[PDB]
Design a protein around this ligand. Structure first.
Ligand SMILES: [K+]
Ligand SMILES: [K+]
Ligand SMILES: [K+]
Ligand SMILES: [K+]
Ligand SMILES: [K+]
Ligand SMILES: [K+]
Ligand SMILES: [K+]
Ligand SMILES: [K+]
Ligand SMILES: [K+]
Ligand SMILES: [K+]
Ligand SMILES: [K+]
Ligand SMILES: [K+]
Ligand SMILES: [K+]
Ligand SMILES: [K+]
Ligand SMILES: [K+]
Ligand SMILES: [K+]
Ligand SMILES: [K+]
Ligand SMILES: [K+]
Ligand SMILES: [K+]
Ligand SMILES: [K+]
Ligand SMILES: [K+]
Ligand SMILES: [K+]
Ligand SMILES: [K+]
Ligand SMILES: [K+]
Ligand SMILES: [K+]
Ligand SMILES: [K+]
Ligand SMILES: [K+]
Ligand SMILES: [Mg+2]
Ligand SMILES: [Mg+2]
Ligand SMILES: [Mg+2]
Ligand SMILES: [Mg+2]
Ligand SMILES: [Mg+2]
Ligand SMILES: [Mg+2]
Ligand SMILES: [Mg+2]
Ligand SMILES: [Mg+2]
Ligand SMILES: [Mg+2]
Ligand SMILES: [Mg+2]
Ligand SMILES: [Mg+2]
Ligand SMILES: [Mg+2]
Ligand SMILES: [Mg+2]
Ligand SMILES: [Mg+2]
Ligand SMILES: [Mg+2]
Ligand SMILES: [Mg+2]
Ligand SMILES: [Mg+2]
Ligand SMILES: [Mg+2]
Ligand SMILES: [Mg+2]
Ligand SMILES: [Mg+2]
Ligand SMILES: [Mg+2]
Ligand SMILES: [Mg+2]
Ligand SMILES: [Mg+2]
Ligand SMILES: [Mg+2]
Ligand SMILES: [Mg+2]
Ligand SMILES: [Mg+2]
Lengths: 260, 168, 167, 69, 77
RNA sequence: UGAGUGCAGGGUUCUAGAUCUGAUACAAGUCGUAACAAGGCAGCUGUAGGAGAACCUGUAGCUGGAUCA
RNA sequence: CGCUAGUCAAGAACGAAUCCGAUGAUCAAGGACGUAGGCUGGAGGAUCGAAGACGAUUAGAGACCGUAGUAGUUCCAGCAGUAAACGAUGCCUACGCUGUUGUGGUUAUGAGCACGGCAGAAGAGAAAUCUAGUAGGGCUUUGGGGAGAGUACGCGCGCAA
RNA sequence: ACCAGGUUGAUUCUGCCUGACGUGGAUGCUAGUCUCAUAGAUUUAGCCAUGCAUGUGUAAGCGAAGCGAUUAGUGAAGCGGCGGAAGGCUCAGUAACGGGCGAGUAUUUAAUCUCUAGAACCGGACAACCUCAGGAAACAGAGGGGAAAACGGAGUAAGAGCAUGUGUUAGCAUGUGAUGAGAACAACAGUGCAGGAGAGUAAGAAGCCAUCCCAUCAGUUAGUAAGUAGGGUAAGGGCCUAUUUAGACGUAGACGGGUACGGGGGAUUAGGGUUUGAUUCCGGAGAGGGAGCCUGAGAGACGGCUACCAGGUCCAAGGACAGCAGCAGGCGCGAAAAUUACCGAAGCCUCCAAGAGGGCGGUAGUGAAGAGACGUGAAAACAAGUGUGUGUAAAAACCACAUGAGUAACUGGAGGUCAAGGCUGGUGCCAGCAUCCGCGGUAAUACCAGCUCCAGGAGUGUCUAUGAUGAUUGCUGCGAUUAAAAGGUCCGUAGUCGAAGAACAGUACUUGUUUGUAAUGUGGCUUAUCGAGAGCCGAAUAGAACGAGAAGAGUUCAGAG
């Protein structure tokens, strides 16, 4: 190919967006920005599907030309702007607030929140560097950058951000007995508490988890975000609190256990 | 050409086998079906359920057995086809009932078809004039007409079927 | 023009390979720059991604570092004495990395004379500086960076290279 | 036409030879064996005529249709 | 130096294996110069290209074994 | 960096050719009758001569022989 | 491979409380032997006898039969590489019923070990018959309806055939 | 998970031919209604008349002529900005960075995000405008004004590389320095543009593993294999060059030749298999054949430029133009494939945009390639028509109600395999039929016809490839005394295969956890009258990361032989 790709066929787009295969050959190619393309969704899919407020391209235009929609405290005017996980969306007229989370199935979903929960988000720490003029810096998963934060924050920790000031508020590390949320894998959207961590060299660390209704599951650190100072969670999670059931369990719970 | 849609019939390996010819001839005659394709279609349907029962009984694991047995038996009860007192949460009866499925016959699927139901409920003088009332819109279910003789009637729809007089 | 692709090259087993594409610009090469000694002449080349590269065709002077005493000076270059790759580049006086060159010694002479131990520490350098001999080695890449820079030969480096010059 | 070979072909029907003139165009077909092989009692002939002047030979012979003229 | 690595390939139809090998040319440094010789087993690490064929460097070795130069009893016993 | 084009060669695939020589099919033509019966000299395998033609003759072998003696 | 003596190397089997310790099975490529007839050079030449020549027999015999007759048939030094070179049954290694008869050693004289012949049985097989019973033991050669064809072209060996 | 007919006067075997059944193309005859898919791939990557497929403007870069004005305004020729490197078409070439799985460097990246973040003066032209005015056309001249956020210079911030300290390695210190800039505007209340550091997207180069036929192709290679040093590139590297070392690859098939877009997948199938993949998704290559190239963040671009070779077009003869493996369409070639149709609507992409553009895409028309559901009467009482409404971008079809009525089957067969007539008339080894076996010489259930039956049925016959039949290719699973088939005998390398006893180790081996699959397929549920269809769910192959078990395999030992 002579240069950069512009289009995106409908069968190639992420299974997390959950778009119907048969209607048309194309899907919206996300603009470059905060999260990766595989870990985010364009804004126009949210307004037409996840939270229905438009039904046609003429309406999608009008909503943003009138400057109505705010993401992380700034007004947005690109219809193909990417939104990702733990990412406050709001309309200042009618004072609505939402976070973006995963269903138990791993699709995307908007969750309504109060104007308290709307003030902060969580991210993971990726690198630490010193910059010209001897200025310390720190960086995060979604392309965030921070000047003169607390030096003790370590790579791999997770940090809570105040959306109005754009400063770090709190820090939590990967240890036994803390709450975790699952970003990618077989168990997307599950929520649980750390049983035990097995350290590996030059390779990913393996983390073992207990679920709130008893189930053990393990995954690699690269798929986990840590979502509380010790015991209990920061953000409010969905109507169902992240318990996943097998078809087998759904049957037992529906028709009763197999008797002797 | 390769294109969308399944094929629902299997052609018999021997075109002029005398025991097959005679036994097919009888069943088309008695039930007032259009041609051999109607019959062969029902035969493939019947074979499919028999295969599932075979597979369940020979499976090694318990999770699949307990899960998929229930689904199979409930489905065939709703169609009004497999009529017996299956009890759930009891492994032996599930096995017993799976074995009773293995000698199910196409006659049982035929008798759920609307053309036969209409005649059997004494709303028509023959299996022929039953078909002729399903054409020409005289037959109605839940207050709506049904144009197609092959409509398979689930268990308990029998209360809502009706006939009306001709338009003339 | 010139290419850097391995299109035309044989396999490790000695067999030939067939060609499956026309040439591509993303493996283009460029002709050599042969930097000569003379009054300054430098050309600016528009490179991939819109960057600029500076190509010295003629150079007169260099920055030369003294490593032991920690100072740097700017001086004229006379001629090439030795070149490790090819005897030809010496006789035609072409400048490259790792060429050994004669320079004006007087600025270095004026500085090194201040140290009372100088004669005792390096007698062969001292002798050379008296006789009007001053030798340095080029470290920059003139065809890439657009200028020449180096360090003054001292101690065992003199003892090594002087044996390459002599008839 | 496709090879510039000259070949022998058989003409199937009762009065079939009468439906063909010299310099007519004919389409020609296989006898149905695994390799190209002789069928029945005809020695060394490997093809048969199918259509004459764009029309079915079966229709010509049985007088169901007429020559294009 | 040339290193040989060996393995088995499974052929599904006949339900059996065939032996295979590949040749890799590796860089040996002067620090190992006297110590490594033909038949020995060697550990190599990956790097950026060093030449047309060369991509690995010898990083250490396991010397082809002797358990013992077996004991001879004294004539006195 | 090189398109095109001179002049010699090769490598492939097809095709022409006076004349010679195989094979196959020849309803039944001409000359004999070599094999199948001890087929009228028991047959056959190797090798070497000879001959209108099947074949005949020397030498060693075999029974699938007309002899389990 | 068949007369008698003398001489020179190596092998098989048997008896037994000898020594070494995995040195082994089968085999593309490569190498050595191979009746007879044939070929290159020397020695020799009794008997027999391709070719060639006659006498008979026959329609005709060029053949069969008889007379005669040459190359060959023998030896030394080599080339060649085929046979119904067949028990038409590959080589190691197993598990397997009885009676009888041989050959060579050894013997508690009761028998064994190696190499054979014969006659039944049981299984097997399309039968005839059985080197063919039982069997996912190992390794090599090899066939896939008749013909054309073990023929054409190319290649390797050979003095030629 | 299946057989049948055919060597003989009969029999039992070996063995092959033929029938019976899926699927991809071609074709004969016949054809009522509605719904879902798909169409010049096979032969010539052959040749092309015509029309269309790429352009974009605000309150907010510069604004000439014209119109008009108490020294206002207007409305815009050109310039600048951003795109034209995506999508669409095809499979020629390539046995290979062409393909699958991991990893993130030795690299460059306009737009976009987060943090941060800007005191600058001067000068000409180019295009349009104005006056002449050339050329058959295509296309151009003189002369004179005049702008920019366009362009070139000045100062000035900044600043590559080199050297030494200190912190791998950013950073900081010191010495030395080539180079060397910069956008604001509007208020409907905003939109831009300079520098850095990190992200995000896209390439370039790399690691491992798998890949077709011929031995009547056995030796191949000399930038070839390596080293030291340098040039070159965005970057590692024989990528290229100088002097030294002789390597590298092969019977476990090198080298040569023939052939091929590769996967996800498709067809058949009890199991083990055998065949195919131009063709909705991903990646690669091309634009008549070869080769060079400017501009740009990005092309060795062809709806850009330049030259040759093969072909064309217009001329006033001097010159000019052009490339349908885009969408319709034409000619050829063949046994082989649709309309020079509508589109401010759906899905997406492009711009300076409350708007403009798109043959990309959607909508219908055409055709028995494929796949669903139903008509052709009932015993009292039956499609297809028509009119309104709906439906859509506008339509047609579909569906609702209301009117008329009484229309609607063919293809192959009837001696055996193989379902169904020794019926009647012609013909007499003729004419014909017959996959195979076989019929006909005047008493033909087999030809040519009439009449009755049979089979499938809006469908049925034929030809051609392939899978099955087939244990006639044999891993599972065939044969070699006489049917086809054990080398004349030894030695022997590569190759394949190899005691008992006591111990040992974990790379194969098996298994856990975690990754690895959109569509298709598999197990399900829910809504279109029903059924294909549509929508949502669950699990999954090969391949890779980390642990575990030690029977078999492997390695060692000798108070074992
Ligand atoms: K004879
Ligand atoms: K001899
Ligand atoms: K004679
Ligand atoms: K005579
Ligand atoms: K004689
Ligand atoms: K004699
Ligand atoms: K010999
Ligand atoms: K020999
Ligand atoms: K032989
Ligand atoms: K013997
Ligand atoms: K046998
Ligand atoms: K020959
Ligand atoms: K017979
Ligand atoms: K057809
Ligand atoms: K093709
Ligand atoms: K003129
Ligand atoms: K074009
Ligand atoms: K076209
Ligand atoms: K067609
Ligand atoms: K429709
Ligand atoms: K008929
Ligand atoms: K008839
Ligand atoms: K008759
Ligand atoms: K065969
Ligand atoms: K076998
Ligand atoms: K032989
Ligand atoms: K022993
Ligand atoms: Mg490429
Ligand atoms: Mg005779
Ligand atoms: Mg005789
Ligand atoms: Mg011995
Ligand atoms: Mg002799
Ligand atoms: Mg042998
Ligand atoms: Mg044969
Ligand atoms: Mg096409
Ligand atoms: Mg493209
Ligand atoms: Mg096309
Ligand atoms: Mg090709
Ligand atoms: Mg400036
Ligand atoms: Mg050189
Ligand atoms: Mg393909
Ligand atoms: Mg291209
Ligand atoms: Mg080009
Ligand atoms: Mg293009
Ligand atoms: Mg299109
Ligand atoms: Mg019958
Ligand atoms: Mg018949
Ligand atoms: Mg056989
Ligand atoms: Mg025989
Ligand atoms: Mg034989
Ligand atoms: Mg033999
Ligand atoms: Mg339905
Ligand atoms: Mg073992």
């Amino acid at each position: 190919v002579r240069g950069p790709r512009k289009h995106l066929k409908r069968l190639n787009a992420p299974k997390s967006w959950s778009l119907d295969k048969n209607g048309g050959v194309f899907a919206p190619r996300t603009s470059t920005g905060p999260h990766s393309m595989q870990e985010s969704i364009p804004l126009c899919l949210l307004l037409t599907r996840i939270l229905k407020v438009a039904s046609n391209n003429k309406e999608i235009k009008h909503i943003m030309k009138n400057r109505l929609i705010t993401v992380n405290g700034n007004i947005r005017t690109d219809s193909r702007y990417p939104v990702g996980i733990m990412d406050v969306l709001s309309i200042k007229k009618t004072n609505e607030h939402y976070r973006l989370l995963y269903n138990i199935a791993g699709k995307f979903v908007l969750h309504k929140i109060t104007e308290e929960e709307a003030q902060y988000r969580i991210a993971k720490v990726t690198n630490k560097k010193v910059v010209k003029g001897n200025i310390p810096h720190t960086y995060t998963s979604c392309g965030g950058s921070f000047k003169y934060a607390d030096p003790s924050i370590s790579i791999g920790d997770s940090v809570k951000i105040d959306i109005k000031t754009s400063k770090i508020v709190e820090n939590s590390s990967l240890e036994v007995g803390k709450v975790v949320y699952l970003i990618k894998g077989k168990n997307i959207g599950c929520l649980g508490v750390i049983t035990g961590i097995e350290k590996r060299e030059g390779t990913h660390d393996i983390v073992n988890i207990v679920d709130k209704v008893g189930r053990n599951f393990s995954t690699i650190f690269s798929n986990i975000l840590v979502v509380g100072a010790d015991d209990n969670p920061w953000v409010t999670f969905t109507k169902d609190e992240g318990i996943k059931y097998s078809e087998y369990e759904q049957s037992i719970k529906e028709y009763g256990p197999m008797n002797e | 050409v390769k294109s969308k849609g399944i094929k629902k019939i299997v052609v018999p390996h021997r075109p002029f086998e005398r025991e097959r010819l005679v036994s097919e001839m009888y069943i088309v005659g008695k039930y007032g079906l259009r041609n051999k394709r109607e019959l062969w279609t029902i035969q493939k349907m019947c074979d499919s359920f028999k295969l599932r029962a075979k597979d369940l009984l020979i499976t090694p694991d318990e999770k699949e057995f307990t899960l998929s047995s229930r689904r199979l038996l409930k489905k065939l009860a709703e169609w009004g086809v497999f009529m017996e007192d299956v009890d759930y949460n009891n492994k032996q009866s599930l096995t017993n009932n799976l074995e009773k499925l293995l000698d199910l016959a196409p006659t049982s699927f035929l008798e759920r078809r609307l053309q036969h139901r209409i005649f059997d409920l004494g709303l028509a003088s023959s299996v022929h004039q039953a078909r002729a009332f399903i054409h020409a819109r005289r037959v109605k279910i839940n207050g709506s007409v049904v144009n197609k003789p092959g409509y398979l009637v689930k268990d308990g729809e029998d209360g809502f079927i009706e006939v009306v007089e001709s338009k003339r | 023009g010139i290419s850097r692709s391995n299109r035309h090259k044989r396999k490790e087993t000695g067999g030939k390979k067939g060609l499956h594409e026309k040439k591509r610009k993303n493996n283009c090469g460029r002709p050599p720059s042969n930097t000569r000694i003379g009054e300054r002449r430098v050309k600016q080349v528009r490179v991939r991604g819109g960057n600029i590269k500076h190509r010295a065709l003629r150079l007169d002077t260099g920055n030369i570092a003294c490593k032991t005493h920690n100072f740097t000076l700017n001086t004229s270059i006379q001629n090439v004495m030795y070149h490790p790759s090819n005897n030809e580049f010496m006789r035609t006086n072409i400048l490259t990395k790792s060429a050994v060159v004669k320079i004006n010694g007087q600025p270095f002479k004026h500085e090194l004379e201040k140290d009372q131990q100088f004669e005792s520490k390096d007698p062969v350098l001292f002798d050379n500086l008296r006789k009007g001999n001053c030798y340095a080695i080029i470290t920059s890449r003139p065809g890439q960076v657009g200028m020449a820079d180096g360090y003054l030969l001292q101690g065992e480096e003199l003892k090594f290279y002087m044996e390459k010059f002599k008839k | 036409v496709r090879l510039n070979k000259k070949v022998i072909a058989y003409v199937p029907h009762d009065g079939g030879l009468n439906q063909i003139e010299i310099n007519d165009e004919v389409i020609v077909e296989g006898l149905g064996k695994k390799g190209c092989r002789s069928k029945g009692d005809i020695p060394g002939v490997r093809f048969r005529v199918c259509k004459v002047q764009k029309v079915s030979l079966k229709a010509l012979v049985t007088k169901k249709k007429e020559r294009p003229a | 130096i040339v290193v040989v690595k060996r393995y088995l390939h499974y052929v599904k139809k006949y339900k059996r294996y065939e032996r295979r090998y590949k040749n890799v040319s590796v860089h040996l440094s002067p620090c190992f110069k006297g110590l490594v010789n033909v038949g020995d087993t060697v550990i190599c690490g990956e790097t950026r290209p060093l030449s047309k064929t060369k991509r690995f460097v010898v990083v250490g070795f396991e010397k082809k074994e002797i358990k013992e130069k077996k004991l001879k009893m004294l004539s006195e016993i």
